[PDB]
Structure 1
């Protein structure tokens, strides 16, 4: 559920524009992958409504606020006022939310992507009243091209061996397409895939018919859970994660034996959060 979740909020009408907070101003801005675009949702079960709290640091507890009687939006000090509560109405099937004012539910948030701001409007069938509300990790990682390193050796990366050898092992970073992965979140599966960039449609897979083996395999389908993964941030790190398999979430991506020699296998294994199951996901 959404209570106490830290999310980004982006525009269905422009998925590269995010709710951005600075100095009491709420605006629409390109992706920053930082606190300026992160919001905590705070549920009141009696109101059946949420406050949308900025993770701003400069100071204070600022929440998304309707500046009635204008149709403008800002961030103001939380006083639990009705103009700081919002109905989050999930448009089921459309991966989107309509965000209605608790004070005046006739009015909903509307993205003015020319002025790069939000206003309140009545409803219509356009995408300008629809918003993607996601865990910030999903948002930060979706469509991100990365290299993946074990924390035990940040100079080596998880790689496909070569264009037609779909085995996956550890090797020194060498700038190759086989050493880069594009992360894609699947809404329907609630999990991610890692597409190797040397191939068009090859994804990191647990080959469970062969023990703990991990290989790249074609993504022809959304039905094989073993081609999907959960990406779990490790607390009190910048960019370190565990990677568990959707077919069995007690199985984690695992650097065999904690060994860091070139050619060490990448496998899955019983997930206990050891250092050989922690991965740095970052820019190439």
Structure 2
């Protein structure tokens, strides 16, 4: 799959190459360690690419916003407040075939991130050894791909993404365990994004471009209007935003932020308020 590619603005588990069941874990307010995989948000990391530097910040997703930092001139690493220090940027360089990634410090590119036998981490000069190879796994792909899901608006604990009765229009509706409210989330390799298939009619969540900008269930198409970048909210892994590929500045949104059964679901410009936030869970 290309779903685990080192994309800007994606959130990952970062594992040692020797153990896919251990992940980089922010254990405290400052310290990181490899730990048994538990999928708490303190084990999830957003990549933020800096094009000028051709290097990334690696930001924990537990709400603290702290970023992986080399404690220059020492050999230790930690999570720290982002002050845009050169020691807070990392080159992520990948072996295309093995999928292994080297995490190389920007301030001193002689130093790479290393995991130790005792699960601690540090920086060190480069060897040919596996203790400096990491694997990145996209969190959302791992969790949601090929799963039957429900999607709740953050506006209300009992309003869900629903195909309308006897219409293709998608609306909010209270839960009634209906196939109109169940969506198969499937990653498309070509588009590098997701489709969401309504269980009732086997048709897909699609932006219908006109002045209303409603979403409807629509037949399978290669057109970008049917494809969605499913992400966590910038600093909250408990909520999702869905950006449409036709215009990735626009997202799945609730008309006038209304909560009534029947409220139109639409695609509108990103602002990130609660009307654009969704809670996705497996059926």
Please indicate, yes or no, whether the TM-score normalized by the shorter chain is above 0.5. Answer: yes
Q: 262, 268, 277: which is aligned to 1:279?
A: 277
For 1:159, the equivalent position in structure 2 comes to 162
Note the 1:8-87 alignment, pairs <5 A: 8-11=12-15, 17-23=22-28, 24-38=31-45, 63=69, 75=78, 86-87=90-91
RMSD (Å) for aligned C-alpha atoms: 5.5
Q: 1:42 to 1:22 in 2, by over 3 A?
A: farther
Partner SS state of residue 225, structure 2: helix
Match of 1:129 in 2: 133
Three-state SS of the structure 2 residue aligned to 1:89 is: strand
Whole-Å separation in 2 of the counterparts to 1:64 and 1:108: 9
TM, length-normalised to structure 1:
0.59
Which structure has more RCO (C-alpha within 8 Å, separation ≥ 6)? 2
How far apart are residue 172 of structure 1 and its match?
1.4
The answer on whether the counterparts of 2:241 and 2:278 sit within 8 Å (CA) in structure 1 is no
Shift of 1:31: 4.5
| TM-score (normalised: structure 2) | 0.59
Q: Return the match for 2:183 from 181, 184, 204.
A: 181
Checking the alignment, whether the CA contact within 8 Å between 2:239 and 2:277 is kept in structure 1 is yes
3-state SS in 2 of match to 1:283: strand
* Residues 89-238 of structure 1: pairs in structure 2 closer than 5 A: 89-91=93-95, 97-100=101-104, 105=110, 109=114, 122-123=127-128, 129-132=133-136, 142-143=144-145, 146-161=149-164, 167-184=169-186, 189=191, 191-196=193-198, 202-208=203-209, 212-217=213-218, 219=220, 223-231=222-230
CA distance in 2, matches of 1:217, 1:132: 34
**Unpaired runs of at least 5, structure 2:** 1-5
Distance (whole Å) between structure 2 residues aligned to residue 53 and residue 247 of structure 1:
28
Aligned-residue offset at 1:41: 6.4
What are the Cα deviations for residues 155-191 of structure 1, in whole angstroms up to 9, with x where unaligned? 12112358x9765332211234542335455576454
Q: Distance in 1 between matches of 2:248 and 2:227?
A: 10
Q: Give the structure 1 partner of residue 3 of structure 2.
A: none
**1 CA distance for matches of 2:79 and 2:205?**
45
Q: Distance in 2 between matches of 1:101 and 1:168?
A: 47
User: Residues 83 and 193 (structure 1 numbering): CA distance in 2 closer, same or farther, change over 3 Å?
Assistant: same
Distance (Å, rounded) in 1 between the aligned partners of 2:113 and 2:274: 47
Give the direction of change, closer, same or farther, for the CA distance of 1:130–1:36 in structure 2 (3 Å limit): closer
Query: Relative to structure 1, is the Cα distance of residues 27 and 208 closer, same or farther in structure 2, using a 3 angstrom cutoff?
Result: same
> Do the aligned partners of residues 7 and 244 (structure 1) sit closer, same or farther apart at CA in structure 2, a change above 3 Å counting?
closer
CA contact (8 A) 2:252 2:268 kept: no
